[PDB]
Design a protein around this ligand. Structure first.
Ligand SMILES: N#Cc1cc(Cl)cc(Oc2cc(Cl)cc(OCC(=O)Nc3ccc(S(N)(=O)=O)cc3Cl)c2)c1
Lengths: 559, 404
């Protein structure tokens, strides 16, 4: 059958401290023993396997299952033990090609290698550990005994050694063809060039030939596939690409399983369809009952799915990559910490799209998210094109300059331009640098008892005003924020506030505009309403003016 | 003959992911590596080598040739016993006292010497490809690599010979080898100094190996600075005891009660208050304690060094090096087309090299910046041949002002 490449071999080893497998062969039925015997004699005839005596002490279980439908049997080898004794290999690949990173080529053809692993040899002093045994009828007769010479399916080193071996082989043909692209994915090669069918079909032939000198068989013209190549979830036409048909289930009652699948699908649709949204849908998942359990659709969720349906009416495709031009990336704020993007080279002809949501932390604002997204996209660009894009962002250069400049954390965005695409990104309130002459100073504090979990929150001001609220299942942190809220409720358009909580100071000082906490959001509306707010910090328990006074106020009964 | 190297027991080789590189850096590394392959310095390697160590391309102060820079942070940790307590290179305490220190790249030296064959495997690295077109190009070292602390560990005894004549003739000169660099300090006038270094590059030159001027005596304090003013405000006092409050805990004797008493009852922050004489006795006392070295704090060699850095805006950055939190070994500022990441890069390098001159080890940096940003951008500006260790933090609100 299936030639076994002349190439050199890869010296495999076993893990330090470990010898090969020695696992007992389970007794098999007669039909199974027979089927196995037919299979093993055929593979032996082809050089794939070899007889050995019982002097070799190693053994690995064999099985044979028939088939859902047809009448041909398969041999199965349980390589669990050998795998757990084989050295670790290098991570085969780290990332799969993205269609949008595919250089636009005049012609490309797909070459899958036939019987990949079986066409490549195995290190000689390793064959011995691949020993397996067809057993006899019951016990009696010693079983028939074999060991691999090629790369076994299901053994840990096969994908790596195959990939290595195909690298070695491709080397010299690359050399004398530096202008031909050969993608290596698993046991496929994808080949493209910028030449007229003519010398294309020839060059490919010359490749096919070069491979065969090396024991690797590939389809001829007529057997090689025609475009659209349906690959890895994608559709790959000669001048565009897209994801394969997505079809969203219409059902009376959605199970958790039904929703997980949907999100997967919509997620997958997001890399070329813009505007795709998934948050109303994911929320449903939080907490969840059975996989087979029906979750009723939220109204907001009905609203998400419907909008998505309208996007998916009418296909969208994406284009390929031209390295002589720049990449442009445009980002739009879609809403609930939701962000959406498009990369293109020539205006509005997109290479791909995406979204960004990922809540980075507990409290944030849009400028921070906007810049998180730029980070995420920059990285994705290096991986795919090997260079970063020119950004176009819905944030004014000034908003940006204020914020980076005054913020404690270091920040940087590549090359960017403003673009006037609402909603624009903005900061919704600034704190003062200096106290507000002729505004009331509130001194705020909060305290909670570590057992009862009870707390008090209040203030005393410099105009004799005072207050103390009680709260029932709190923590110190919650009480301190509560205090600040109070102070903002009864304060009117310009307050100075003084706190001893570095905690709240931190939160507020970063100009949050969204939070996981209802309390922090309450605080946000106050602050937005205000005209001038100044906020300042003192240490606690050092009798200080207003502070000593609220401290005892909110202490009474708590500590 | 090769000095055989042992791993720190039970534990074994580095398996660090490789970062995505841009096309230009990939090309530059392909070039560089093809060349050192032709010279026998590295060799393509097989699937059966499961180790990996990231690799990048940098520039280096004035130059238009890319340099290769291999991150051996992992490897160095897994070999700490070999290079540190077995072939250790003693740090001379005199080095920080010299009027000038010059730093010289001695890294091309290591390519003379071959690497113990049973260690080569631990040095594996990968040049990635774009969009995953092809498998990375893998390689390992046949010789002492730049950036691995074992290299100067081993090379130590040849380095002593290279320098013996020159040490004999300038006995008041300190030469210290740290990783890929030589540190050379003298008390000479700046002309005679640059001359002695010129002269030292000929000794080096005669043996293969083929700059940077520091002034360590002129490295002085960053005193926690309190203001001087007429008309002190409630706020200013609050701020004052604030800053003062925190200065005690490291500074022994800082007192606030007098200052503190000033503010009593519940009054407006803008209200101006008069500063009673007893209060000024603290300011002063504090002021002087505040300009001095700590007292109590000593380098312990067995402990790690930490460095924290804060963004003060308008291009300046403060920092502190310590081993026990608060127990400050050193504090400083750094000031500056220059963005944040560029700046943060310059400072990290500058603190690291000081830290190298003073203690002969580099700090773990707490970096006020998002991982990803830093990781994507740090090499655009990096120029050193070593890499310190770092983690990512969220600068406290107050720590900023207190070191302001
Ligand atoms: N990963 C992956 C992957 C997976 C598979 Cl199955 C195939 C594959 O081949 C490639 C390889 C390259 Cl170098 C570019 C590319 O796409 C852009 C392009 O120019 N295509 C393109 C151009 C002409 C034709 S024609 N007229 O020859 O039919 C067909 C096509 Cl697809 C597609 C890549």
């Amino acid at each position: 059958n299936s030639p076994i490449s002349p190439i050199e071999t890869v010296p495999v080893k076993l893990k330090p401290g470990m010898d090969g497998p020695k696992v007992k062969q389970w007794p098999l039925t007669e039909e199974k023993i027979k089927a196995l015997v037919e299979i093993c004699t055929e593979m032996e005839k082809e050089g794939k396997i070899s007889k050995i005596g019982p002097e070799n002490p190693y053994n690995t279980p064999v099985f044979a299952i028939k088939k859902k439908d047809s009448t041909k049997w398969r041999k199965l080898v349980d390589f669990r033990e050998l795998n757990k004794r084989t050295q670790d290999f290098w991570e085969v690949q780290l990332g799969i090609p993205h269609p949008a990173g595919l250089k636009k080529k005049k012609s490309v053809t797909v070459l899958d290698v036939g019987d990949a692993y079986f066409s490549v040899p195995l290190d000689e002093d390793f064959r011995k550990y691949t020993a397996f045994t067809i057993p006899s009828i019951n016990n009696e007769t010693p079983g028939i005994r074999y060991q691999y010479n090629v790369l076994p399916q299901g053994w840990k080193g096969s994908p790596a050694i195959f990939q290595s071996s195909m690298t070695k082989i491709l080397e010299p043909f690359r050399k004398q063809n530096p202008d031909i692209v050969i993608y290596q994915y698993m046991d496929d090669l994808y080949v493209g060039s910028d030449l007229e069918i003519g010398q294309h079909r020839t060059k490919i032939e010359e490749l096919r030939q070069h491979l065969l000198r090396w024991g690797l068989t590939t389809p001829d013209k007529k057997h090689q596939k025609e475009p659209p190549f349906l690959w890895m979830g994608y559709e790959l036409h000669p001048d565009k690409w897209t994801v394969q048909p997505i079809v969203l289930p219409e059902k009376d009652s959605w199970t958790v399983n039904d929703i997980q699948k949907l999100v997967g699908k919509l997620n997958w649709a997001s890399q070329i369809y813009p505007g795709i949204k998934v948050r109303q849908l994911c929320k449903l998942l939080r907490g969840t009952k059975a996989l087979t359990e029906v979750i009723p659709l939220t109204e907001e969720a009905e609203l998400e799915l419907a909008e998505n349906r309208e996007i998916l009416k009418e296909p969208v495709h994406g284009v390929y990559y031209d390295p002589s031009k720049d990449l442009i990336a445009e980002i739009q704020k879609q809403g609930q910490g939701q962000w959406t993007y498009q990369i293109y080279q020539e205006p509005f002809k997109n290479l791909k799209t995406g979204k960004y949501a990922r809540m980075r932390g507990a409290h944030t604002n849009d400028v921070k998210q906007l810049t998180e997204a730029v980070q995420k996209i920059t990285t994705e660009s290096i991986v795919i094109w090997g260079k970063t894009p020119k950004f176009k962002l819905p944030i004014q250069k000034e908003t940006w300059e204020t914020w980076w400049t005054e913020y404690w954390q270091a920040t940087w965005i590549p090359e960017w331009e403003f673009v006037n695409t609402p909603p624009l990104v903005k900061l919704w309130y600034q704190l003062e640098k200096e106290p507000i002459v002729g505004a009331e100073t509130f001194y705020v504090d909060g305290a909670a008892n570590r057992e009862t979990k009870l707390g008090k929150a209040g203030y005393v001001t410099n105009r004799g005003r005072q207050k103390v609220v009680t709260l029932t299942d709190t923590t110190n942190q919650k009480t301190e924020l509560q205090a600040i809220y109070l102070a903002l409720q009864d304060s009117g358009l310009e307050v100075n506030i003084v706190t001893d909580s570095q905690y709240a100071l931190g939160i507020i000082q970063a100009q949050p505009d969204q939070s996981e906490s209802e309390l922090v959001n309450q605080i946000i509306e106050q602050l937005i309403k205000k005209e001038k707010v100044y906020l300042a910090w003192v240490p606690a328990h050092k009798g200080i003016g207003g502070n000593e006074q609220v401290d005892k106020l909110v202490s009474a009964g708590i500590r | 003959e090769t000095v055989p190297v042992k791993l720190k027991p039970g534990m074994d080789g580095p398996k660090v992911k490789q970062w995505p590189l841009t096309e230009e850096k990939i090309k530059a590394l392909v070039e560089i590596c093809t060349e050192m392959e032709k010279e026998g310095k590295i060799s393509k390697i097989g699937p059966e080598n499961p180790y990996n160590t990231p690799v990048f391309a940098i520039k280096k102060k004035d130059s238009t040739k890319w340099r290769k820079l291999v991150d051996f942070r992992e490897l160095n940790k897994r070999t700490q016993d070999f290079w540190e307590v077995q072939l250790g290179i003693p740090h001379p305490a005199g080095l920080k006292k010299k009027k000038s220190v010059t730093v010289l790249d001695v890294g091309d030296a290591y390519f003379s010497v071959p690497l113990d064959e049973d260690f080569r495997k631990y040095t594996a690295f990968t040049i990635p490809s774009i969009n995953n077109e092809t498998p990375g190009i893998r390689y390992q070292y046949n010789v002492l690599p730049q950036g691995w602390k074992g290299s100067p560990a081993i090379f130590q005894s040849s380095m002593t010979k290279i320098l013996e004549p020159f040490r004999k003739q300038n006995p008041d000169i300190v030469i210290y080898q740290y990783m890929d660099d030589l540190y050379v300090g003298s008390d000479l006038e700046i002309g005679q100094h640059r001359t002695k270094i010129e002269e030292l590059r000929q000794h080096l030159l005669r043996w293969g190996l083929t700059g940077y001027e520091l002034h360590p005596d002129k490295w002085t304090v960053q005193p926690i600075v309190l203001p001087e003013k007429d008309s002190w405000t409630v706020n200013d006092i609050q701020k004052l005891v604030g800053k003062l409050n925190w200065a005690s805990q490291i500074y022994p004797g800082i007192k606030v009660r007098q200052l503190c008493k000033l503010l009593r009852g519940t009054k407006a922050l803008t209200e101006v208050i008069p500063l009673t004489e007893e209060a000024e006795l603290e300011l002063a006392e504090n002021r002087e304690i505040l300009k001095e070295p700590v007292h109590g704090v000593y380098y312990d060699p067995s402990k790690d060094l930490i460095a924290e850095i804060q963004k003060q805006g308008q291009g300046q950055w403060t920092y502190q090096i310590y081993q026990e939190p608060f127990k400050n070994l050193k504090t400083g500022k750094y000031a500056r087309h220059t963005n944040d990441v560029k700046q943060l890069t310059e400072a990290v390098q500058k603190i690291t090299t000081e830290s190298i001159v003073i203690w002969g080890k580099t700090p773990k940096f707490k970096l006020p910046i998002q991982k990803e940003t830093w990781e994507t951008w740090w090499t655009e500006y990096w120029q050193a041949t070593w890499i310190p260790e770092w983690e990512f933090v969220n600068t406290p609100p107050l720590v900023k002002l207190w070191y302001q």
